[PDB]
């Protein structure tokens, strides 16, 4: 599934962090998000949260020659190799 409803619903949760100063930790975010939906569409949902998060800015330490580490989630094999989305861009 790829419902426009969810997508907008998602931008809401993510844009939330854009508001404050709280950068985006796709690992923490995905971990919480995917817990709301059944493995039904984890891959699909994850993908969205990854493209959406990427729209709302980038990562600072990304340009520091610092390797990002695969952060697992689930009590299984899910991983996300991404830095923290520091600097947002209006």
């Amino acid at each position: 599934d790829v419902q426009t409803q969810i997508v907008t619903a998602i931008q809401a949760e993510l844009a939330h962090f854009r508001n404050t100063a709280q950068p985006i930790n796709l690992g923490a975010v995905l971990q919480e998000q995917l817990a709301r939906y059944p493995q039904s569409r984890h891959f699909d949902v994850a993908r969205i949260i990854v493209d959406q998060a990427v729209k709302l800015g980038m990562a600072s330490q990304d340009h520091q020659a610092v390797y990002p580490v695969w952060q697992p989630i689930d009590d299984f094999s899910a991983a996300v190799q991404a830095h923290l989305i520091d600097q947002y861009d209006k």
Binding site: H42, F43, V50, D51, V54, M58, A65, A79, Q81, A82
Partner: protein
Amino acid sequence: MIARGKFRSLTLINWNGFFARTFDFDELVTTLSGGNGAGKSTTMAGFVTALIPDLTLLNFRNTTEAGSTSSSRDKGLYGKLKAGVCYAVLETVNSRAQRIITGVRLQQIAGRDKKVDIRPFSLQNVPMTDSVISLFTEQVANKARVLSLNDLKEKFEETAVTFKPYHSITDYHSFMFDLGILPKRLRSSSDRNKFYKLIEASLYGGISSVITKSLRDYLLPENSGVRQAFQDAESVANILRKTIQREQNRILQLNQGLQNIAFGQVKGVRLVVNIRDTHSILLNALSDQSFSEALAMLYKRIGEELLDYRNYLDLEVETLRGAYGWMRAESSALSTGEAIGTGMSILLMVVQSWEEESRRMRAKDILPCRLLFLDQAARLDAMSINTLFELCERLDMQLLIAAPENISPERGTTYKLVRKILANQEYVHVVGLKGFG
């Protein structure tokens, strides 16, 4: 049950739009997603570049221009690089769980023209914990810095780690061959040509004409003994045949792992072994009718090149469509999808062929890595894409596919590239995912 060698990561340093970047390859399938111009090909680019740092071959034409014989036009790598020092490093883990590291130091020469400078090297014994990036970069005044080869040397002089900068590419490969990464021995530029040529044919995909034309150069092995056990009447004619058959039998096996194929309307691909009509008679003479000079006459009647059995055979690929059964593989008559799924298949045979032809000159607890590409994968329909995956699983092979699409497979690792702009420079924002499934 021997564990096979796998590629673990690709790290580009200072590459255009990629300052310091590592791509973790999946144990089976790794997909790079992103939009047009995202940087997925310059990734697969850098990979190749490190795999074969030969500026004589390295030539990245645009896919829209494939069967181009153009040898003048720009090679296309210079621009994927940034000014100054640049890297391309490959991380392989041996059949002996040995973490080996082989790369190249790419550096655009004194901004006058568009020529690039490359230097192969290798790092050995790096701990499985230390990041591959950390090795090539510093931290000077809270600012990141790319150290150079001479700086790496120092850094690893009074260490267990073994940094070996190669002077001749020939040694660079001679190295990857021993630590068991490459399937073949690239002893010469003739050997390099073929290696690259093949890689080139999987990136761009489809039926390679250069390979087809001379198929018995990428398949028929040189039995190191038919000459030796010779120089030291019909005995020849018999051994020649007792060799042609032996090989035929060999191929006859590869041909089996491609009968239940599924690319477009193609349901299978064979390697047909045909005997040249000329030598076909010569073999008849030595049977029912100074030595090299002898055959020389027989050939004429109807040199040492007639002692090399591969010079008798004549390969020919065939595809199986539910219509005329087995027809000779022909671009003109195949769709793009089957075109790709056919060549990709031929390719598998060449790799299997090479790798086994090397079991001798190699240890017995070492099985080379095996990874093939697929740029512009969207060309394949899901049905075809499954035949590739299942084929690779069976031959236990690694795949790296570029999806101009923004919907990757759920099998393996997926890296998402998004080219942004900061400080007015190209900055690719990468995000990998894996585990879902």
